[PDB]
Design a protein around this ligand. Structure first.
Ligand code: IMH
Ligand code: IMH
Ligand code: CA
Ligand code: CA
Ligand code: NI
Lengths: 327, 326
């Protein structure tokens, strides 16, 4: 029935909406673990939010508990500090601090505390009986670390990697004085690791770059519909996180917030989310204006990556609204 | 219960303040509210005021009341990032339950017709008993009323409980052109502030940063609303505070405080804090200290009762309990 999945995320709002999608769809996904990286959040906050959401869901829908580990990966280029604070706010949301759920997390916290994110990813994959799908909604540093340490012994156990990252035929979202805006943030955080992943042979990769994520901006109308399901803990949770993003486009002309990681996780639940196109992907790692950019390379026999195209937005929007009703 | 009118500018503490005043029907009869385009975008701030009112009306004995948008304009606008918080609340699921949004949609046309400043003037003056004005945004609207009606307006005011200024502590307006002595609410419109604090015949209770600095919004307390998720107001208040606990780390010590909430608590119950009389003047000049509240030696200068040593635990318990109103 369900396939094994590990969520490799960096604790922002869409990372958590992504978590809820994967966790709530028990018929399609068997969530066997998660790791949080100190990228688009402060790892301690992301770690606790991951734990709190898991416990809330364990008590309300019998979701099997799984290991959560903090990655030791460090940044090449850190995310803006303002974005990394979001996990802190979520750690304090009343919906994630219900006594029975917080009590459970407190009971299993010390154990998960002992895990090192990167080694955990490698063990969950390599020790799994069946192959494992890795959903990467943060930087690629952990998959790369596993690839460098274990090579084929690791990749051969990977069903596929579904990745939120990049921008192939559309501009990126990294706008700084020294960049040209063609790079996307997850790749930009650790270019070298991304390149390692995208160049790895014997590894299936599904890539959700901005080309596809640009079709799902977070808008008020849709977000307010979660207000129709306040009887469900996950709807209060998902709607709240989304409600915290509807201002972005207004704050930075058009450079709004999108359901990046959410759309990516949705594909893991049901590939009908989008079709794909094979593309040889390389990553600019030098200190150039487009550092972090994902570009097609025509190097001989370069491994292919399946780039998502023309996502089924309506299907995705209905999936999220109904998944937020699992409990 | 005494008649109260909330004069706010739509930020997170403004809304918690609103909940505090509205939920305590035993001490406060909330007869109206106005929102100013200051620390929010008036449309979002107006709409959230409406959404909160209807949520409460439909779940507890809270009479509906008029809500108006102020025509006041800024001298020095708030930071855009801060003004977006009302847009965020506007889309929160707890404020978008069908039954409450339907009510709001139904009474909206009546309220979106009121002019905030005139509404404040009419509510105060035509009231049978005297009215207490809780000001949690700039002082533009009370000044407008003073300018237009003078004594006819002030004589009907029980007292103005104002969240604003900094007297013996550093302010919180940190900009390239400022020296940090000014507090945001006064800074937004110095001249209106000057008018109110220099008004003879008007009683003023001032909650300056001197007292609000004892109430930073911190994680441990915020998480306690998690023990009350069966009450809509706890989900609402806890969610708003949860969106503030980050400021201290982001702004190196310059965190978020329960500024307007503390001010409002005192209206509910004065045991919240004692007061010291102080001649409060305001700097309106385009200097590095524009918007500063300073003691003046001028003879016959009207006194203002500045809050001192607030009862923190008392205030904190009041909010948690009030948050269980529904
Ligand atoms: O404006 C933003 N706020 C918070 N996170 C992101 C991101 C993060 N990077 C990825 C998309 O660029 C996605 O995983 C998301 O969590 C891009 N822009 C923002
Ligand atoms: O960092 C901030 N974010 C949002 N609002 C405020 C304020 C507003 N100004 C008053 C306190 O200085 C109070 O009414 C509050 O709503 C000061 N600092 C901030
Ligand atoms: Ca992410
Ligand atoms: Ca305010
Ligand atoms: Ni009614």
């Amino acid at each position: 029935s369900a396939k094994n999945v590990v969520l490799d995320h960096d604790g922002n709002l869409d990372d958590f909406v992504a978590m809820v999608l994967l966790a709530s769809n028990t018929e399609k996904v068997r969530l066997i673990g998660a790791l949080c990286t100190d990228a688009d959040c402060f790892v301690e906050n992301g770690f606790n939010v991951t734990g709190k959401i898991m416990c809330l869901m364990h008590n309300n829908m019998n979701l099997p508990l799984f290991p959560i580990g903090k990655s030791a990966a460090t940044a090449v280029n850190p995310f803006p500090k303002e974005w990394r604070c979001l996990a802190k706010n979520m750690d304090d949301m009343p919906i994630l601090n219900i006594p029975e759920n917080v009590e459970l997390w407190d009971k299993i916290k010390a154990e998960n505390e002992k895990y090192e994110g990167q080694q955990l990813l490698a063990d969950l994959v390599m020790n799994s009986e069946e192959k494992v799908t890795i959903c990467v909604t943060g930087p690629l540093s952990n998959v790369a670390w596993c690839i460098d340490k274990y090579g084929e012994k690791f990749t051969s156990k990977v069903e596929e990697c579904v990745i939120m990252g990049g921008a192939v035929d559309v501009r990126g979202n990294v706008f700084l004085p020294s960049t040209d805006g063609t790079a996307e943030w997850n790749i930009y955080w650790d270019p070298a690791s991304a390149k390692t992943v995208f160049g790895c042979p014997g590894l299936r990769r599904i890539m959700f770059s901005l080309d596809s994520t640009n079709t799902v901006p977070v808008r008020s109308p849709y977000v307010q519909r979660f207000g129709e399901q306040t009887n469900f803990l996950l709807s209060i949770l998902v709607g709240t996180m989304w409600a915290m993003c509807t201002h972005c486009e207004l704050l930075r002309d058009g450079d709004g917030y999108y359901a990046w990681d959410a759309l990516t996780a949705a594909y893991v639940v049901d590939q009908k989310v989008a079709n794909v196109d094979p593309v040889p992907i390389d990553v600019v790692v030098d200190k150039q204006p487009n550092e972090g950019a994902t570009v097609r390379t025509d190097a001989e026999n370069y491994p292919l990556t399946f780039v998502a195209r023309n996502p089924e937005a309506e299907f995705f929007l209905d999936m999220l609204l109904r998944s937020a009703r699992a409990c």
